[model samples]
Every structure is written in structure tokens, then in C-alpha cells.
Target chain A: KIRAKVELTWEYEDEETAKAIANAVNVDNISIPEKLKKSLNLITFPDGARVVTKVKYEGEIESLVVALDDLIFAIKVAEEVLWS
Target chain B: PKRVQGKIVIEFPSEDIAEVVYTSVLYEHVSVPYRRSRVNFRREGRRIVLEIEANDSSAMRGTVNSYLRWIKVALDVLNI
Candidate 1:
């Protein structure tokens, strides 16, 4: 049994920025097909202006690895768009 | 993003093997000052845990990849 859990929390200076980043990533999650063993979600913390990405996979570590890579890739692009 | 956090836990066959891998990767872990991301690496019994907090997605990706790569190297070198 291979299980990997990824919790990625990114906090910004303001709630607006955090919401924007969360919105940016949320769009991708909506369209992406779901898997039985993998689950990912994003949450925005109003108090701290933090965006948290939590991913849990039970079955294959490779799938978890791939998911995290894709997750960060999207986040990176989102940040580049918003920050730049 | 101001802060990004991640956790990875790997379990080896035995505590001895886990210690070996932990120490090997720890050398590189402590060698550099992490400006963007900070990592707390530890071994518990037969498991190696990595708790990472980063400034942004870029740092998150880099830190995760680097640690995983380093661990992979150690495992490969030792044929584990």
C-alpha cells in the first residue's frame, strides 16, 4: 500500500492576492477529470491570505509524484500571470 | 504566494536502511541555506519524513524535486 499526501500552502500579503491565486488554480481543478486514488483541492484562508493545496493518493506513489508536478506547474503559471 | 508547505514520508524496509538514507540526504540538506523554502527532515523508525514550507510555488517545486532527487540518488547508489 503506497500512500502519499501533499499539503501545499501558499500565503500572500493580502487576501485579494490569495483569492486571485485560488481562483486561478480553481479553474483547472474544475475541468480536470477525477481519479479513484487521487484527490486534490484548494482552500483560501481569509484570515491569513493563504492558499492551500492538498493532495492525497492511495495506491501509486508515481501518480502522486505526477500530480504534484502538474499541480505546481499550474500554480507557477498562475503566479507568473498574476505577479508579472 | 507568501508561504507554501508540503510533506513527504517514505518508509524503508528497516530502521537501519532508513537511517542510512536519511543521513546521506541530510548532508546535502544542511549544506545550503534555504532562502525560499525551509525543510525539516527527519527519520522515525523505518520512515523518512520531509516537511517543507516555501515562499512560492517555484520554491515548492524546486525543494520537493531536489529532495526527491537526492533521495533517489542515495537509494540508487546503495541499490536500495
Candidate 2:
């Protein structure tokens, strides 16, 4: 459960929100190897960033669904933190 | 209505969508165990051309249906 093994990405107007959400995620917060745990990666593209699961990890399909669902849910929550 | 030199033309609105259909179907095409006959499925500009032989009506239905389903999914995903 330390590495994510599934991925899905939606385009954003900019990386501001993506970066915020990405930084907030970690490989269960182990943050090691030089003290960093990054099981999820935010790959930047011209129009948006694609969220990629740690490609090396062999995770169940359900694991991917959980990771992506939670990630999107958090992003939705951040869309209008106080306004909502 | 199967006959000699059966031909099919699947046209997309544009070449981009057509290309997506091409790549999408390609993976499945390569993996499947298709019985070799005089059938050709190819992309030409914005169209997918299917030319089949009249002799082998044995697997025609399966071939036609498989091709349609692949393109169908790709088209649905691309919304075209």
C-alpha cells in the first residue's frame, strides 16, 4: 500500500491547484529515501498536469480507483474551500 | 448481404478522431487470433476501409462485429 498503481488525470486551467493537491499527497507520508515518499506523481503538460500512479508499483485495480477517487474528491473540495 | 469484394467505409468527422480509432483498434487487432482471409481494415485519411473476400463467410460476422465494437468504444471515448 506504499505505492499507487493506477492513474487518471483531468486537465486544469493551470497547475496552481494541481500543485497544491500533489504536494499534499505522499506515499502514506513515509517521505523517505532522502526522507521522501512520492507514490503519486504530478506530470505537467502544456494545458494541464496528468496524475500518474507510481508506475513501478504492482497495485490492484481497486487501489487505483481509491487513489484517484480520493485525489479528485480532494481537488473538488479545494475548488471552493471557504466559499462552499 | 455479403458478396464478392465486400467493402466498408467508416468515416469520422476529422483525421484526429480517425487516428484515435486507428491506434485504439490496433492494439486489439494485433492481439486477437484472426483467421486470415482476404479482409483488410485500414485507415485512409478520415475513413476506415474494410475490404473482405466473398469466399470466407465463415467468420465474417465475428470479424465485422469485432471491428465495429473496437471502433465503437474508441468513438464513444472520444465522443465522435
Candidate 3:
């Protein structure tokens, strides 16, 4: 059994920026698959200028890693576009 | 095969500590072959950032676990 619990925290300089990026990511990738929906979570709440991503998986590690990679890409794109 | 990635940012109490830890880990980071997975380990002020990209789940898990274990060893040996 390959079980993984991945927690990613993105700390920004200010609450306004954190909220913007969190919502940006949410809006960009709202249509998620059922499997991912069950295991994936995006904390868009304003938590001291930080956005937290949590994923818990109980299957093949490959799937989790793939999903994690996509999530990270999405977040990075949001940051790039917003500031650039 | 699909590509996968993960990132970890560890914050240290001081920039000096972070630099030392990052340097110690860099030895293994560069030494490891990147056949299945690739690593980007660097320091940003008081934080040590590690990024991993792999072709398979096993590779991703192994790389993540090894980096984390190495970091723990460094911190423990230094009593920090």
C-alpha cells in the first residue's frame, strides 16, 4: 500500500497577495476529477498570508506525484501571470 | 510517461544555518545521478528550497524521502 500525505504551504509577503493567488489557482483549476477532488484540497482562506495545499493518497505513488506536479505548475503560473 | 514534481521549503532560524545545511546537502544532491529523478536544491536567505521532478512514483517517493532524511541527519548532527 502506497500511502502519501503531502502538505504544501506557499507563504506570501502579504494577505492580499495570498488571497489573490489562492483564488487565481482555484479559478484556473476548478474542474477537477472525482479522484483528485477526494484527495486534493486547496486552502484559499486568508491564513496569515499563506496558501496551503493538502493531498492524501492511498494508492500508487505515481498518481499522487503526477497530480502534485500539475498542482505546483498551476500555482506557479498564477504567480507569474499576476506579477508579470 | 508523465512528469511529476514536488517542492519543499524549510525555514531555518538564521541565514548562516540555512547556508550550512544547504551546502552539506548539495554534496549529495549533485552526486546523485538523475536517471529517474532530478533535484534542484538551493537556499533563499533563511530558507532551504528543494524541488524534485521524476518520471515515476517510486522515483518521486525515493527522492523525497532521501532528501528529507539527509536534511534531518544534517540538523541532528549539528544539534540544530
Candidate 4:
């Protein structure tokens, strides 16, 4: 099986800023897959947020391509609603 | 074409800073094109270790530069 991940990290000035971005992009509303084939994560620290995108397939380029696509979309959402 | 290899351990200034930096950028290193090289990474306390083996001279340059660029960006973002 081939799998890939793309991680995007962005900084915030403080916990409040980071938490605001975390709230803006909260993945709680997103459905979790019953299968472990693919996954995405949003992690927050004192200074920033770490967004992880994972894609896996038996034999395909979807691993990296799909993950990168999803990751960019996530970043765009944050850029519009939070960064802007 | 002969293969080239490299290993490096980068130590951060502080343990706390290392954890955050490593965690923040760890996943950024994983999606490389495997045909260019076989790369491995890990964190040991305040140090980040990188292992690379490239198939040719061009592959060596390309693969190495990509990681270096990523590391630079990682630090750049962390600055205030």
C-alpha cells in the first residue's frame, strides 16, 4: 500500500490566537472515518496549529495528491475566516 | 550513477522549543517522491535526526535541498 501525508503549520501570537484558529477550523463537526484508510488532524500548541492530512490507497497517486489537495483547502479556509 | 548518502542531527536551543518545532514540522517531511531518495527522520530529545540516500548526484542535490528549504520555512514561521 502507498500512503502519504502533508502537514501545514501556522503560528499564532498567543494561546488565544491559536485557540481562535482552532475554533475557526474545529474538526469536531467533521465525521471520523470508520476505516483507517485516510485521516486528517488539527493539533494546536501554545504558539500555533499543526494540520495533518493523510491519504492511503492500495496502488495509486491519491496518497500525496489527495492529501495535498485537502490540506490546501483547509489552509484556505483558515486564511479567509481567521487570518483575514 | 553512484548513490550518495547523508546523516545529520540538528539540536535545538532548548528542549521545550525543540518539541514544539519538531512536532510542528514533523509531518512536512513525509511526502517526498520516493524515486528520488529514501529518507528517514526521528527526534531524539532536543535533536532531530535525518537520514538520506540518493540514487544519483542530481537526486542527492534535489532531495537535500528540499529538506533544507522545509527546515528554513519551519523556522521562519516560528519567529514572531
Per-residue alpha-carbon lDDT of candidate 1 for residues B1-80, written as tens digits (9 for 90 to 100): 66677778777666776787799899888886756668998888887888987776788888887786676667667663
Comparison by lDDT, 1 against 2, better one:
1
lDDT accuracy of residue B53 in candidate 4? 66
Residue A50 CA displacement from its true place in model 4, Å: 40
Collision count for each candidate, in order: 4, 5, 0, 0
Could you tell me the lDDT of residue B55 within candidate 3?
Answer: 61
TM-score of each model, paired residue for residue: 0.72, 0.42, 0.49, 0.44
Q: Per-prediction DockQ, in order?
A: 0.49, 0.02, 0.06, 0.03
Q: Where does candidate 1 chain A have its weakest 10-residue lDDT segment?
A: A36-45
> Which residue runs does candidate 3 get wrong by more than 4 Å?
A1-84
lDDT of 3 by residue, A24-76 (tens): 76674643444665564433343667766665555433455556555556566
The collision pairs in model 1 are A9-B4, A10-B3, A11-B2, A11-B3
- Return the lDDT, model 2, position B35: 61
Q: State the lDDT of candidate 2 residue by residue for B1-80, as single tens digits.
A: 11223344566677898799889988877777756445567888876766555332234434544665676678677763
* Ranking, DockQ, top scorer first: 1, 3, 4, 2
Candidate lDDT values, in order: 0.68, 0.46, 0.62, 0.47
Interface RMSD of 2: 20.7
Question: Where's the lowest-lDDT run of ten residues in candidate 4 chain A?
Answer: A28-37
TM-score of candidate 1 to 2 decimals: 0.72
> Which stretches of model 1 miss by more than 4 angstroms?
A29-48, A59-61, B33-36, B76-80
The positional error of residue B28 in candidate 3, measured at the CA in angstroms, is 0.6
RMSDs, each prediction? 3.8, 18.7, 11.6, 16.1
